[PDB]
């Protein structure tokens, strides 16, 4: 994928609402500013949230729904020197560009904009929402969050709904905008997405890839992540086994519970191990400030060393042999009076014992 340098993209959670102030007329080759402005939006309804009166710099303002023009190759979009072109949360390739630099504002960072040369990323202090999967909720038409803006900034229990024929990209953009609104909420808000589990998982995967793109473009890390459905099911099983009411315990706190074990016992909690495995299907390593070693799923590892020590570091032949293994297994079977379900494995060792 290639992008034309004439497009400049700014990424900011704030862009869930259109940045009227940031728009500015572009100049032609003759350095003549263009008083005509064209704003592109992903859906027709978006037009209602563009206030033409907020563009004093321009004399004429028009708004249209950006639509993939199959007749134009995005590698070289047509230019329209007669107007300044701005795209808001584009979901399809930009086939048209304005005078000077075509401006783009987006809360999402799809591949289309990923290769865009000029990338301005606004940084925010993270503020995470609460996943509240559960069958007094406040329904929210995700396609039009700004309509529910007041409720989104006031209440704390939202049922996220979508029109049947809503497109996947529209869903992704709506979710991103809602999550930005929550990022600006002082109080985290619980929400439930009225969608099939697989669809929600795919949406979360795409959002994760978008966040990865933002990081690669220089965005600040945010702990406000999301959990795949299998991971949520595992966490729920763990909480139930421990006798923890699901509504009472949040996943984040549940995981944090084992930070007391992480360092002092120099062990990786099994919950974190399982979550990492789920993400992999969709290894671990960490340390402490000034620490000389790293705790990993494999055990202790010298800092900056590979996750596994050289193969010949330790000789296990003494016990890592069929004779010893069979002897121990037979002893166990005899002592316990067992006949099946018994399995003994030699213990290997990483860098350290």
């Amino acid at each position: 994928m290639e992008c034309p340098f004439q497009i400049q993209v700014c990424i900011s959670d704030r862009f869930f609402a259109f940045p009227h102030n940031l728009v500015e007329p572009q100049s032609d080759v003759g350095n003549k500013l263009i008083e005509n402005l064209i704003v592109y939006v992903p859906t027709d309804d978006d037009r209602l949230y563009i206030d033409k009166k907020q563009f004093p710099k321009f004399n004429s303002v028009l708004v249209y729904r950006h639509e993939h023009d199959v007749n134009i190759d995005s590698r070289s979009p047509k230019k329209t020197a007669s107007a300044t072109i701005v795209y808001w949360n584009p979901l399809v390739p930009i086939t048209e560009i304005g005078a000077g630099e075509t401006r783009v504002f987006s809360v999402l960072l799809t591949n289309n904009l990923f290769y865009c040369n000029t990338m301005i990323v606004h940084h925010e202090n993270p503020k995470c929402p609460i996943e509240f999967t559960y069958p007094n909720l406040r329904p929210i038409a995700c396609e039009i969050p700004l309509s529910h803006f007041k409720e989104l900034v006031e209440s704390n229990d939202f049922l996220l709904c979508f029109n049947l024929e809503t497109s996947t990209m529209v869903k992704i953009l709506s979710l991103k905008r809602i999550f930005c609104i929550f990022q600006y909420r002082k109080q985290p808000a619980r929400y439930v997405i009225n969608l099939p589990h697989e669809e929600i998982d795919n949406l979360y995967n795409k959002l994760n890839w978008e966040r990865t793109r933002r990081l690669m473009k220089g965005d600040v890390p945010s702990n406000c992540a999301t959990v795949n459905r299998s991971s949520l099911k595992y966490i729920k099983q763990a909480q139930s086994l421990l006798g923890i009411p699901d509504y009472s315990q949040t996943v984040v706190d549940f995981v944090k519970m084992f930070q007391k074990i992480i360092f002092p016992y120099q062990l990786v909690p099994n919950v974190i191990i399982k979550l990492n495995n789920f993400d992999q299907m969709v290894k671990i390593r960490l340390f402490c400030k000034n620490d000389s070693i790293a705790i990993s799923s494999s055990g202790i590892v010298p800092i900056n060393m590979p996750d596994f020590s050289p193969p010949n570091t330790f000789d296990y032949s003494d016990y890592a042999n069929r004779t010893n293994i069979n002897f121990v297994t037979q002893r166990v079977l005899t002592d316990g009076g067992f006949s099946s379900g018994i399995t003994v494995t030699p213990v290997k060792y990483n860098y350290y014992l």
Binding site: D51, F149, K150, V153, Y184, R185
Partner: protein, 33 residues
């Protein structure tokens, strides 16, 4: 000593940014049309 004035100002803005957006999506006094 080039402090991260940008980050500080960004956080300060973010504090009331939601209120500003609420003002934008508030009600209007009259319907000119």
């Amino acid at each position: 000593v080039d402090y991260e004035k940008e980050s500080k100002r960004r956080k300060l803005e973010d504090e009331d940014f939601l209120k500003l957006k609420a003002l934008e999506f508030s009600k209007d006094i009259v319907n000119e049309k």
